[PDB]
Short mmCIF file of C-alpha atoms and ligand atoms in Angstrom, two decimals:
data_model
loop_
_atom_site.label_atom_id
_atom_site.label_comp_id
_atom_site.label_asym_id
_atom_site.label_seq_id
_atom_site.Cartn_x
_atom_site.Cartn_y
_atom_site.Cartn_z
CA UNK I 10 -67.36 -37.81 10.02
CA UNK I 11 -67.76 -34.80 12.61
CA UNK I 12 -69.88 -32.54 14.05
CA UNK I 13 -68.86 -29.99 11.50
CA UNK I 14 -70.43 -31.16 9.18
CA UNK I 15 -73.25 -29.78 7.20
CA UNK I 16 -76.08 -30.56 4.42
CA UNK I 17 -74.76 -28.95 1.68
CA UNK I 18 -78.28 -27.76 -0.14
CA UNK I 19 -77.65 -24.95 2.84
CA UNK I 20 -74.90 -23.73 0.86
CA UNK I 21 -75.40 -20.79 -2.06
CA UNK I 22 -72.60 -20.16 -3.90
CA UNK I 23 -72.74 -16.58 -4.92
CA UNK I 24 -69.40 -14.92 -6.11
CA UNK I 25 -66.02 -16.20 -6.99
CA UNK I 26 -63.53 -14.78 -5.04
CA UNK I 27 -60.39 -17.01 -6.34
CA UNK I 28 -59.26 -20.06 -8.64
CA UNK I 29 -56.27 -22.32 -8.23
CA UNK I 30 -55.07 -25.32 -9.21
CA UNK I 31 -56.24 -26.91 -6.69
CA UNK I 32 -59.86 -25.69 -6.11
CA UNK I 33 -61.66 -22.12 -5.31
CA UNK I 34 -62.88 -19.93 -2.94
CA UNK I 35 -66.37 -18.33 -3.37
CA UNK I 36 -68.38 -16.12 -1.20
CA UNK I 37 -71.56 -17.45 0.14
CA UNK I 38 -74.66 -17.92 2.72
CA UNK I 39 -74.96 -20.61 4.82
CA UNK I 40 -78.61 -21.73 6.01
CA UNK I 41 -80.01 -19.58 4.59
CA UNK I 42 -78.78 -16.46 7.02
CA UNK I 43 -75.18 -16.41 7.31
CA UNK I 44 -72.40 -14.67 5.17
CA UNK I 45 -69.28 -17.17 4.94
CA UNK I 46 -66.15 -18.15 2.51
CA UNK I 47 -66.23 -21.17 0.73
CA UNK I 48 -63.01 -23.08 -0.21
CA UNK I 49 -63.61 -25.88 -2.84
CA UNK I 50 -61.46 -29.12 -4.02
CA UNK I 51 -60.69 -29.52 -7.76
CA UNK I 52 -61.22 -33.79 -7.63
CA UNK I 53 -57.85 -35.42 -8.29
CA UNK I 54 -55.90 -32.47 -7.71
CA UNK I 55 -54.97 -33.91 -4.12
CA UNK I 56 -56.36 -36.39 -1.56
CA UNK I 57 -59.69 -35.98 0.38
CA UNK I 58 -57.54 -36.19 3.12
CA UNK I 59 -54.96 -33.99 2.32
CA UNK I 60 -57.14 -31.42 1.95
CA UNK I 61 -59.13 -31.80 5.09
CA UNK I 62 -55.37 -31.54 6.59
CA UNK I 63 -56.86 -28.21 6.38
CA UNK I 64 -59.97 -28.02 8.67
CA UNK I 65 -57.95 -30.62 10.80
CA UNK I 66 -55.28 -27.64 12.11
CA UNK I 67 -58.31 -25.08 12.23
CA UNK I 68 -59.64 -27.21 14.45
CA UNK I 69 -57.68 -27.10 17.22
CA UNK I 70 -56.85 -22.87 16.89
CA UNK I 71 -59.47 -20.40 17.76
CA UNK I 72 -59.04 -17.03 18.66
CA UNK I 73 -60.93 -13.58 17.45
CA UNK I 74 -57.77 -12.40 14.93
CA UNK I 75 -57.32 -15.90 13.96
CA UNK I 76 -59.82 -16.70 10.71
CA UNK I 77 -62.66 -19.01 12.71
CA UNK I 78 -63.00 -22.64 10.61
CA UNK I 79 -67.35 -22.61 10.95
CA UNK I 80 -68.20 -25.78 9.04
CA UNK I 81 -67.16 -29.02 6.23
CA UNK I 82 -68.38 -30.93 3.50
CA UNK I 83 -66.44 -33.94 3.83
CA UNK I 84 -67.31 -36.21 0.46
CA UNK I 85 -67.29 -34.82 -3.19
CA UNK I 86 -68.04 -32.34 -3.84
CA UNK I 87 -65.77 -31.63 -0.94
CA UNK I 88 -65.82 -27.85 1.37
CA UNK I 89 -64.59 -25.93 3.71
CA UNK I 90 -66.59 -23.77 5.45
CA UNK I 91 -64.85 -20.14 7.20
CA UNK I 92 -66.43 -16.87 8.07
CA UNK I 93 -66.39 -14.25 5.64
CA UNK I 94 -64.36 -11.25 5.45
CA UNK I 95 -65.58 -8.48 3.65
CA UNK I 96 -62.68 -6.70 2.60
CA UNK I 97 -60.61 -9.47 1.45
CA UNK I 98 -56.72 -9.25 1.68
CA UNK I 99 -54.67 -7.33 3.44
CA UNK I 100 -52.30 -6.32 0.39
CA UNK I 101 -54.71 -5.78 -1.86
CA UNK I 102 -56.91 -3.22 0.81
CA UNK I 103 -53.39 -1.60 1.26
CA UNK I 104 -52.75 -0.79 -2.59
CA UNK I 105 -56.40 -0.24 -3.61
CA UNK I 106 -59.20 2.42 -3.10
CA UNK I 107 -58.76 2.48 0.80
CA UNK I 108 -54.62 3.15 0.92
CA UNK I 109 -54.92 6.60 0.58
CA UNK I 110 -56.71 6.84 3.87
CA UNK I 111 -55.02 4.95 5.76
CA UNK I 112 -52.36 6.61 8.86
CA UNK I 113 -50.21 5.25 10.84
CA UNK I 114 -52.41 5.08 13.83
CA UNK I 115 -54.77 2.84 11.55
CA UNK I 116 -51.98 0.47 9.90
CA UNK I 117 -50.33 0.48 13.63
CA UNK I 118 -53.50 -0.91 15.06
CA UNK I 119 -54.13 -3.46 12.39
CA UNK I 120 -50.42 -4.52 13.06
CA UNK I 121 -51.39 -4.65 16.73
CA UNK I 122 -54.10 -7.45 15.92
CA UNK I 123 -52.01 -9.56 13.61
CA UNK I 124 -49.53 -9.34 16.74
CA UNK I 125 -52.46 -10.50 18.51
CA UNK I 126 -53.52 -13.36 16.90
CA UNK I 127 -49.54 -14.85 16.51
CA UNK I 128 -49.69 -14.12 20.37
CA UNK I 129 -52.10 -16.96 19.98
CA UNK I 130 -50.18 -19.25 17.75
CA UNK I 131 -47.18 -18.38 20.03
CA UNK I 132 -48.97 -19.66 23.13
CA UNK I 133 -49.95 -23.04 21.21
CA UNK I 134 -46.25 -23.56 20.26
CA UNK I 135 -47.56 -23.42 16.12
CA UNK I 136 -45.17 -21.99 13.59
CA UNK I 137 -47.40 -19.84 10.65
CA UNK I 138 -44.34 -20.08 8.17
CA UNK I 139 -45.96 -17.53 5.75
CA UNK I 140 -46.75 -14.83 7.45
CA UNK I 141 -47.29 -11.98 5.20
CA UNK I 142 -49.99 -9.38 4.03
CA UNK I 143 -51.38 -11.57 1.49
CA UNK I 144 -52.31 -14.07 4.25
CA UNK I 145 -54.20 -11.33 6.57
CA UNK I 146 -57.72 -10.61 6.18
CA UNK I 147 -59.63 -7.30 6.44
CA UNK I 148 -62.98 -7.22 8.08
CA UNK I 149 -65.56 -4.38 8.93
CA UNK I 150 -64.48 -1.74 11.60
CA UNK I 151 -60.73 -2.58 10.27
CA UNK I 152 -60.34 -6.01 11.85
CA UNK I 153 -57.71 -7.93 10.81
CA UNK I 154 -57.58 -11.54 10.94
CA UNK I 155 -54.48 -13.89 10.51
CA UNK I 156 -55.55 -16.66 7.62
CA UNK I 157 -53.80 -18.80 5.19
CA UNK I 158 -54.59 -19.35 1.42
CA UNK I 159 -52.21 -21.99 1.15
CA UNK I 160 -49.18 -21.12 -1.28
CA UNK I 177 -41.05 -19.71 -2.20
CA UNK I 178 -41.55 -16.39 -0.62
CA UNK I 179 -38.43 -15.53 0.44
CA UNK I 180 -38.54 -11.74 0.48
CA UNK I 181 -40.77 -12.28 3.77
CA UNK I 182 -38.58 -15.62 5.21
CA UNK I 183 -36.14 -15.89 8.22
CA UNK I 184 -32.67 -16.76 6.74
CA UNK I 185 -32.00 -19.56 8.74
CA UNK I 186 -35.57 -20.96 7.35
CA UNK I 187 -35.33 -19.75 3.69
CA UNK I 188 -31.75 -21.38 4.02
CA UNK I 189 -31.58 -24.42 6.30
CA UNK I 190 -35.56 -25.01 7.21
CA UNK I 191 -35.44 -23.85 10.86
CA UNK I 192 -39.30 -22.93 10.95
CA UNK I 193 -40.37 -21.50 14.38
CA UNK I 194 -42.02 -18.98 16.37
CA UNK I 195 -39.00 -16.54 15.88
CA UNK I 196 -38.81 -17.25 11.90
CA UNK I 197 -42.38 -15.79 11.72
CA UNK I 198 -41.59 -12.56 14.05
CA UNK I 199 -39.02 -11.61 11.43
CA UNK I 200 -41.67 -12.43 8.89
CA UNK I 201 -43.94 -9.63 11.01
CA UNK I 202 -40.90 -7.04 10.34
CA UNK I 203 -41.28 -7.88 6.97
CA UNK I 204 -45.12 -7.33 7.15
CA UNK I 205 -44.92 -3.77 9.51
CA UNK I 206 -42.77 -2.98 6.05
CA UNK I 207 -46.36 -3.84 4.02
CA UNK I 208 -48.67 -1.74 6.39
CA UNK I 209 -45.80 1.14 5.72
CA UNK I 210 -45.83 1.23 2.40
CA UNK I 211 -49.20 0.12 1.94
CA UNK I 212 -48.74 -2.62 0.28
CA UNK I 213 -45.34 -2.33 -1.55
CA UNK I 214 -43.14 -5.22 -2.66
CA UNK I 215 -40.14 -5.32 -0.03
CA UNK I 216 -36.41 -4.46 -0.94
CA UNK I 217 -38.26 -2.81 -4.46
CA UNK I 218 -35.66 -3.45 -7.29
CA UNK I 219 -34.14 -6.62 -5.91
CA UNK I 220 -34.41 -9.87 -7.33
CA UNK I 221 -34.55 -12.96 -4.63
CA UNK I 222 -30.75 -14.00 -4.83
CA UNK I 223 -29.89 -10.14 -4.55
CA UNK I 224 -32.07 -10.44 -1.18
CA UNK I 225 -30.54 -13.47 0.04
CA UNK I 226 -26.86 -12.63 -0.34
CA UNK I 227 -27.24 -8.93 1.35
CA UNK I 228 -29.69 -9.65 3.78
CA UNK I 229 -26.88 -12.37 4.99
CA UNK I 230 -24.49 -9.42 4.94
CA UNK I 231 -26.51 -7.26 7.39
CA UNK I 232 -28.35 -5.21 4.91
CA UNK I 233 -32.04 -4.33 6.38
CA UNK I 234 -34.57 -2.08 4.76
CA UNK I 235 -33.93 1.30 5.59
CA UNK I 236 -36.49 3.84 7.51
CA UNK I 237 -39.90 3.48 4.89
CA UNK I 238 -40.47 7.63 4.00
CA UNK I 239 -42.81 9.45 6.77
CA UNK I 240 -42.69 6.51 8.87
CA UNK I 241 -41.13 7.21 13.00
CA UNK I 242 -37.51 5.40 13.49
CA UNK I 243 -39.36 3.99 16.59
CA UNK I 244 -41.02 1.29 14.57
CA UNK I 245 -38.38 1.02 11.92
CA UNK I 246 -36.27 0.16 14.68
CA UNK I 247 -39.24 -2.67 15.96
CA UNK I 248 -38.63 -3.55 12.98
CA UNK I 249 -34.85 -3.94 12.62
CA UNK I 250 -35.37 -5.75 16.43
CA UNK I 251 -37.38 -8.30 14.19
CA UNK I 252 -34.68 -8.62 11.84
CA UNK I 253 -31.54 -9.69 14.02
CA UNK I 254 -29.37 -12.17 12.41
CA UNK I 255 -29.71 -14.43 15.57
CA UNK I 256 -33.14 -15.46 15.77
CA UNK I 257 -33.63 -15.73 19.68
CA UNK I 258 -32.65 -12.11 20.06
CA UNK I 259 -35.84 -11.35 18.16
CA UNK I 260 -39.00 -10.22 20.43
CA UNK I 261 -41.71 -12.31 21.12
CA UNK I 262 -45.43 -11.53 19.71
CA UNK I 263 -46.58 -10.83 23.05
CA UNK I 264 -44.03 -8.14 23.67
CA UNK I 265 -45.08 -6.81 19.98
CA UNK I 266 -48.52 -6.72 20.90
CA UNK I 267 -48.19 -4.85 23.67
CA UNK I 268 -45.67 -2.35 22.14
CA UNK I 269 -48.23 -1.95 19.08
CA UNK I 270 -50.95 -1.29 21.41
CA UNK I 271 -49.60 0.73 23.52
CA UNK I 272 -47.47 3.07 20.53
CA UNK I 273 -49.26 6.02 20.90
CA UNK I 274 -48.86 7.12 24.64
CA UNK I 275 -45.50 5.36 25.08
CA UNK I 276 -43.38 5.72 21.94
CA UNK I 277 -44.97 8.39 19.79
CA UNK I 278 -47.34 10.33 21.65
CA UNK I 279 -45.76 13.59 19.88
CA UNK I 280 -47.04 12.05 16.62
CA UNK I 281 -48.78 14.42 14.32
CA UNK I 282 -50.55 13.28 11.13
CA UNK I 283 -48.05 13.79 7.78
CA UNK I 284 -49.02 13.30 3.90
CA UNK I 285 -49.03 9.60 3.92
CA UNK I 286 -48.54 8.42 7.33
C1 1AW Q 1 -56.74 -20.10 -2.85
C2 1AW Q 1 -57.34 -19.42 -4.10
C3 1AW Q 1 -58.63 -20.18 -4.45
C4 1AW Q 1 -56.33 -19.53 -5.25
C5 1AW Q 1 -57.60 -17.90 -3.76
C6 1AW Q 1 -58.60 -17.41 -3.01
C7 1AW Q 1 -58.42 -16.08 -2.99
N1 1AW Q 1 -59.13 -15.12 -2.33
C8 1AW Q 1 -59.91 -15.34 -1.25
O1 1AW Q 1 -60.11 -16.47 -0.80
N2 1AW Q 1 -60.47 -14.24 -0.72
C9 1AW Q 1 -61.30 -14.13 0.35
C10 1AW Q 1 -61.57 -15.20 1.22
C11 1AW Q 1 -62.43 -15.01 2.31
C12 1AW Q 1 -63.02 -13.76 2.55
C13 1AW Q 1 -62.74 -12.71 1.68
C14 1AW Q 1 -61.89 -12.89 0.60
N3 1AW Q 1 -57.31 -15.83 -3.70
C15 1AW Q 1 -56.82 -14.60 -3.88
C16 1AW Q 1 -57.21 -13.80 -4.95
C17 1AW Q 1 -56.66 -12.53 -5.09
C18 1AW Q 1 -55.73 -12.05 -4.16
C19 1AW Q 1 -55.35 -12.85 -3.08
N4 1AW Q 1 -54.46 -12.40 -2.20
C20 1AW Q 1 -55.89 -14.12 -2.94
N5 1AW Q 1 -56.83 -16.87 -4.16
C1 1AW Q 2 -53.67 -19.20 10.53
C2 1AW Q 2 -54.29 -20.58 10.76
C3 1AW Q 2 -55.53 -20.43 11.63
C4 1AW Q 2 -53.22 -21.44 11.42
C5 1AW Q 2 -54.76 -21.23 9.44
C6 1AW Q 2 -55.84 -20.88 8.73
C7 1AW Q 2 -55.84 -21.70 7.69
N1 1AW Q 2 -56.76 -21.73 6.70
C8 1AW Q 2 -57.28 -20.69 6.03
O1 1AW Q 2 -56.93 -19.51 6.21
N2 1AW Q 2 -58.19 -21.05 5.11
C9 1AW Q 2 -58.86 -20.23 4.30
C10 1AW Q 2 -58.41 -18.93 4.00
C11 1AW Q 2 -59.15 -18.10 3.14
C12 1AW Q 2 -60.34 -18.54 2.58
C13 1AW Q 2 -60.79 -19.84 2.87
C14 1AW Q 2 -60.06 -20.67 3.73
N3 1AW Q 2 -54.79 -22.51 7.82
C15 1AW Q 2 -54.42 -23.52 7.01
C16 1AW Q 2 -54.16 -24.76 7.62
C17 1AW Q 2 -53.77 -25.85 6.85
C18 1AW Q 2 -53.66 -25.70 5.47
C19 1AW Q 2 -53.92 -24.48 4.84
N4 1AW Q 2 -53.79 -24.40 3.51
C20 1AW Q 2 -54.31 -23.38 5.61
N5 1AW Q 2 -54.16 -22.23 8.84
#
């Protein structure tokens, strides 16, 4: 019974954007004005509360690359109310119309903002635990946004979580490595022709993806420092940030636009 609460005949449901089992997301306007994303319950699919669990930890994180919570519904029909990015996923921006395009300066700097807004979660001691491209959202001007549609994914998990639930900070960072893979490939599927188990057993052998084609050892090497078996050798996201921002006068200032990257 907050103050984010709003009448809900200044809401306009205007295009689906996803269906679940347990509700939908549709894009909107909100009084009137004001371009937002929608996120519905599907009654007795879950608890009122449950579901508000939702708006409850959105609450407490803002930050400009973390998806801004604007407003609720809270009694059937229940909503949650988020700003709207235009672009939709990260993955599916990578694969589709705009993936040609894309260079490594661009997919570095939207890697620099993800890095950003886990600098965020880092600082409030919060754990993501599903970190991935499908979970980042594309804006205007290329922003990037870290989000969370709410969904194993092992490809992208920390060993030590995938295996014996140790969740943290550092479980996600490997989880990034996994992502800087995404941005690199736009959009590819990680370790391509493995099943999970194949993953799980090598992985816990050493194996790492090798260098993706036309993309500097530099990074694939940010990325391997991601991947260390022990997971407090792994960087934090404010040392990532600042490497990603800085790449291009410190690391790679030699680097001359290829094919694909
Ligand atoms: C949680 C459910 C309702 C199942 C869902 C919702 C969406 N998609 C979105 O919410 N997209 C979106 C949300 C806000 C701004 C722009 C796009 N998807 C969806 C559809 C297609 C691809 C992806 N990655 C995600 N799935
Ligand atoms: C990355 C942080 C800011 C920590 C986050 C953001 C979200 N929620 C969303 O991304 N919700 C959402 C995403 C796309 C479209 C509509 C709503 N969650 C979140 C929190 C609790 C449950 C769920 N499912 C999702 N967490």
């Amino acid at each position: 019974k907050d103050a984010w609460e709003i009448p809900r005949e200044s809401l306009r449901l205007e295009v689906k954007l996803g269906q679940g089992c347990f509700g939908e997301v549709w894009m909107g306007t909100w009084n009137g004005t004001t371009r937002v994303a929608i996120k519905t319950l599907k009654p007795g699919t879950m608890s009122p509360e449950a579901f508000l669990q939702e708006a409850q930890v959105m609450k407490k994180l803002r930050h400009e690359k973390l998806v801004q919570l604007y407003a609720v519904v809270s009694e059937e029909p229940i909503y949650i109310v988020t700003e709207y990015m235009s672009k939709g996923c990260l993955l599916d921006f990578l694969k589709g119309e705009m993936g040609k395009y894309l260079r490594l300066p661009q997919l570095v700097d939207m890697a620099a903002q993800i890095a950003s807004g886990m600098a965020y979660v880092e600082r409030m001691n919060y754990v993501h635990r599903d970190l991935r491209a499908a979970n980042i959202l594309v804006g205007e001007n290329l922003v990037c946004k870290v989000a969370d549609f709410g969904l194993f994914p092992i490809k992208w998990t920390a060993p030590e979580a995938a295996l014996y639930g140790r969740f943290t900070i550092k479980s996600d960072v490997w989880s990034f490595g996994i992502l800087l893979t995404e941005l690199t490939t736009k959009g590819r599927v990680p370790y391509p022709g493995m099943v999970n188990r194949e993953v799980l057993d090598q992985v816990e052998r050493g194996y790492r993806m090798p260098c993706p084609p036309e993309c500097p050892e530099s990074l694939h090497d940010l990325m391997c420092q991601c991947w260390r078996k022990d997971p407090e050798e792994r960087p934090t996201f404010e040392y990532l940030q600042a490497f990603l921002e800085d790449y291009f006068t410190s690391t790679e200032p030699q680097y001359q636009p290829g094919e694909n990257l």
